[PDB]
Write a protein that binds this ligand. Sequence first.
Ligand code: CL
Ligand code: CL
Ligand code: CL
Length: 171
Amino acid sequence: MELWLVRHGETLWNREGRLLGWTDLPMTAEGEAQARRLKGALPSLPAFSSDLLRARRTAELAGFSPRLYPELREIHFGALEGALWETLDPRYKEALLRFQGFHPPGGESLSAFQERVFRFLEGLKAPAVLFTHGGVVRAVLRALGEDGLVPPGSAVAVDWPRRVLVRLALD
Ligand SMILES: [Cl-]
Ligand SMILES: [Cl-]
Ligand SMILES: [Cl-]
């Protein structure tokens, strides 16, 4: 089934290289600009969005009025929230690079995160635009056997759960 996934515009922690999960940070001005650029580029489909500020504000600026769902949130990094990528212990770095066996103290395991996400996608009964986070888009792209890193404010359309349709980036 056709689905459009949107990664929210950038926040400060993106340029700072800090893990951003359930920490509810706002986007930067550039993030807001990235969200506006999406207007007129996404299809007119029912919209759903993470309840975190940066996501639904991206939804708003993109010209949508999405229903909110916590299930579309980024992974909960637990004690690793706000942690600089550079300083992460090898085990966490590798876990995130290889996207496997990630168990952050006080947070969500990558396994639990994927089940939440894939379970939400399975519940969808019709094509829709999903305003979410980098880790969610990444989970979906990798599961479809592809590189999961896309630019903030960019989008991807897939035919879940068979293949990737298009990657839309607006410079
Ligand atoms: Cl379809
Ligand atoms: Cl895991
Ligand atoms: Cl299938």
